[PDB]
Write a protein that binds this ligand. Structure first.
Ligand SMILES: *[C@@H]1O[C@H](CO[C@@H]2O[C@@H](C)[C@@H](O)[C@@H](O)[C@@H]2O)[C@@H](O[C@@H]2O[C@H](CO)[C@@H](O)[C@H](O)[C@H]2NC(C)=O)[C@H](O)[C@H]1NC(C)=O
Ligand SMILES: [K+]
Length: 311
């Protein structure tokens, strides 16, 4: 579909048309708060008499579940300042740029990093630079170093004898993690192999004997790759303690309600490509729980077991 169609002929360079040499970039780190790394070009690209400059924001990731956020001012949003701004790729963040020879060329981000989460929306607006901001969350595990780029280029905006600047985001993801504690429900080529290697327990449709068992401790990250024919799941909005009596009219209890400061990722299961959810148990949380949820298939259910801080 149009959301992520690659243009194989597109090519640019870091400098674009600015005639600014790479040895003359203004390079700086992303602004990182907890696990959100932000490249904000709101006050970096305005026309000045010494423009164009190149403003290069460097995102360096070596730990799991980092959310990257890039803010690029909209064309026409302020008088004069952004008259000719442009962003590349237009289909960011589904499409990114990577280095090939001296050039930057388009690649599918999801093919680069298995399990990366792109939500359809950012604060109830479409996840696309036309709305001013894009976001994506990196997964619990990354196997190979990956470097990719975005462009937010105001250098063609000319005001009197002033020119805007060209903004670059370089995201450098180093490898981290090995496998995700949890389960992959597989159907039984490159994508099929990844699906088999990323979770500690694989569950095949035929002749499986062990239910999904997610064993978590303080600080740990868990995850599940849900079956393709999933109809619905109560993981993790309705966990049930299976060491207590089950009453179906009891109110629902989420993992978040049961485990203070736990975080669930892609809880709506609307991220593109990957039918996954990740969970993080805080290091603070020290109690023991034994819970289960369920996965209902499309026309038959799967039981899912979660243990937290088992003695
Ligand atoms: C670096 O970022 C902080 C925090 O930014 C906010 O939180 C991030 C996680 C991200 O979601 C950003 O979009 C947010 O703006 C900045 O601090 C804040 O500054 C703004 C504007 O002055 C203010 O409205 C907020 O109240 C401030 N505090 C918080 C907790 O957001 C900080 O200015 C940034 N520093 C630089 C040099 O850019
Ligand atoms: K009973």
């Amino acid at each position: 579909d149009e959301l992520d169609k690659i243009d194989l002929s597109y090519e640019t360079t870091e400098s674009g048309d600015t005639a600014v040499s790479e040895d003359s970039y203004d390079k700086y780190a992303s602004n990182n708060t907890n696990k959100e790394y932000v490249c904000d070009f709101t006050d970096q690209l305005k026309p000045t008499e010494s423009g164009p400059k190149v403003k290069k924001c460097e995102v360096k990731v070596n730990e799991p579940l980092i959310k990257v956020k890039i803010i690029c001012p909209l064309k026409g949003s302020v008088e004069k300042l952004y008259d000719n701004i442009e962003y590349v790729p237009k289909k960011s963040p589904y499409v990114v740029l990577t280095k090939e020879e001296t050039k930057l060329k388009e690649k599918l981000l999801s093919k680069l990093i298995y399990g990366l989460l792109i939500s359809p929306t950012v604060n109830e607006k479409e996840n696309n630079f036309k709305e001013g901001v894009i976001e994506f969350t990196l997964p619990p595990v990354v196997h190979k170093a990956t470097v990719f780029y975005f462009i937010c280029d105001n250098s063609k905006t000319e005001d009197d004898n002033k020119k805007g600047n060209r903004g670059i985001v370089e995201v450098y993801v180093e490898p981290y993690g090995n496998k995700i504690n949890g389960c992959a429900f597989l159907d039984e080529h490159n994508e099929k192999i990844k699906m088999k290697t990323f979770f500690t327990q694989n569950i095949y449709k035929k002749n499986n004997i062990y239910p999904c068992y997610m064993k978590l401790y303080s600080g740990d990250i868990g995850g599940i790759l849900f079956p393709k024919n999933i109809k619905s799941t109560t993981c993790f909005e309705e966990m049930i303690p299976y060491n207590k009596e089950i009453k179906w009219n009891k109110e629902n209890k989420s993992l978040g309600n049961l485990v203070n400061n736990s975080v669930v990722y892609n809880k709506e299961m609307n991220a593109k490509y990957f039918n996954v959810q990740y969970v993080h148990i805080p290091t603070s949380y020290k109690d023991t729980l034994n819970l289960f949820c369920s996965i209902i298939l499309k026309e038959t259910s799967y039981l899912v077991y979660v243990s937290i801080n088992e003695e």
